């Protein structure tokens, strides 16, 4: 299911940034129906939201220490409300399109 999710915590133009997920993150997105190689950050957040629900990882905390998401983010858990922190962890797993 294609879509996008935006937040008031991140600048609008930043959520429009075109990105190329690295192979593990790309594989994760394709496991929940993504089909392309290039995305906006807001589409990436939509697919990751679907992945968190499918894997049942969601006090508003996601527990991801025994999941591929935990390996990519480098944390055992995180608040779903701290959007800059989530953006920081996602940026480490992709290449911003030049
Ligand atoms: C509920 C989930 C299935 C857990 C998905 C979440 N939903 C967004 C979100 O902010 N919910 C909270 C709103 C306030 C409520 O009191 C508690 C939940 C969040 C969100 C939306 C836009 C941008 C950012 Cl950065 C963001 F975090 C959310 C999402 O869409 N995709 C995504 C990906 C990762 Cl990796 C973590 C958390 C989410």
Swiss-Prot record:
Miscellaneous information on this protein: MDM2 RING finger mutations that failed to ubiquitinate p53 in vitro did not target p53 for degradation when expressed in cells.
| Full-protein interval shown | 10 to 111 of 491
Q: From what organism does this protein derive?
A: Homo sapiens
Stated name of the protein: E3 ubiquitin-protein ligase Mdm2
Location within or outside the cell: Nucleus, Nucleoplasm; Cytoplasm; Nucleus, Nucleolus; Nucleus
Q: Where is this region: Necessary for interaction with USP2?
A: 1-97
Tissue expression per record: Ubiquitous. Isoform Mdm2-A, isoform Mdm2-B, isoform Mdm2-C, isoform Mdm2-D, isoform Mdm2-E, isoform Mdm2-F and isoform Mdm2-G are observed in a range of cancers but absent in normal tissues.
Quaternary structure, per UniProt, is: Interacts with p53/TP53, TP73/p73, RBL5 and RP11. Binds specifically to RNA. Can interact with RB1, E1A-associated protein EP300 and the E2F1 transcription factor. Forms a ternary complex with p53/TP53 and WWOX. Interacts with CDKN2AIP, RFWD3, USP7, PYHIN1, and RBBP6. Interacts with ARRB1 and ARRB2. Interacts with PSMA3. Found in a trimeric complex with MDM2, MDM4 and USP2. Interacts with USP2 (via N-terminus and C-terminus). Interacts with MDM4. Part of a complex with MDM2, DAXX, RASSF1 and USP7. Part of a complex with DAXX, MDM2 and USP7. Interacts directly with DAXX and USP7. (Microbial infection) Interacts with herpes virus 8 protein v-IRF4.
UniProt induction comment: By DNA damage.
